[PDB]
Ligand binder design. Structure first.
Ligand SMILES: [Ca+2]
Ligand SMILES: [Ca+2]
Lengths: 148, 153
């Protein structure tokens, strides 16, 4: 089911707030980001809507400046971010089958009172964005929770 | 951008066998999110696209398990801090990211195509490993055609 726990501090969250819910919006945000050729990892979305995504920590300032200038188009209420988050992953080949992973990791991080900001799942991995100060804790909590 | 070709699973999946649950009105006192999902996982329902953008939880379930999820979360809704709705006319579009050098070109494209046809993205949920979105099931054939065209299948 779950064979390893990975973690990675090279993360920055970026938020685009209260953007009109029309087609083409997502593209506008990302396309801007992808022509500065910065990689983007997680993306999360939803008469308004909110668009959160992750950027390698080193691209935090540029991304905010790319969106600051394209805030005209897009037309967002606010643009903020967080460069003190990190990603922690439950990883294991042979997994999609086992269903209570999202739940279990939520449950276990909940006990330690550590807020999950974002989640993404797949056959191969399940990942959460949390504040960096929880990284070790979360890794250890989860590592325990899955018997190594 | 050769990335779609590099994908190991080169393609876009369309799943009309899905339904969106929106658990509305949730307070921020102890691990309430778990009672939500553990209740769904105990019934052995598989879950995907968990979002929390003072804030609500939203997710997807195979369509054949919607009438059950709704009820499992219904008779536990005044046991969990819960004010309120689901949606069983959604279709999930997804591409798998393992193998791709970059994943953002593909995602921005996927978004651009749907935009050009006036198809609105209901929910996004993507990472290095999978790029997935939610659109209205009425656009499924249209989405398949324009997306197949855009990535040459
Ligand atoms: Ca800072
Ligand atoms: Ca912090």
């Amino acid at each position: 089911a779950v064979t390893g726990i990975a973690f990675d501090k090279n993360q920055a969250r970026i938020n685009v707030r209260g953007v009109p819910d029309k087609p083409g919006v997502a593209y506008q945000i990302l396309g801007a980001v992808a022509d500065a050729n910065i990689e983007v990892d997680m993306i999360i979305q939803n008469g308004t809507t909110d668009f959160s995504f992750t950027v390698p920590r080193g691209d935090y300032k540029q991304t905010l400046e790319i969106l600051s200038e394209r805030q005209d188009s897009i037309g967002a209420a606010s643009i903020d971010g967080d460069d003190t988050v990190c990603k922690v992953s439950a990883v294991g080949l042979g997994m999609r089958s086992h269903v209570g992973v999202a739940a279990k990791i939520f449950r276990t991080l909940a006990e330690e009172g550590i807020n999950i900001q974002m989640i993404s799942t797949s056959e191969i991995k399940v990942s959460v964005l949390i504040d960096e100060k929880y990284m070790e804790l979360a890794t250890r909590v989860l590592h325990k929770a899955f018997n190594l």
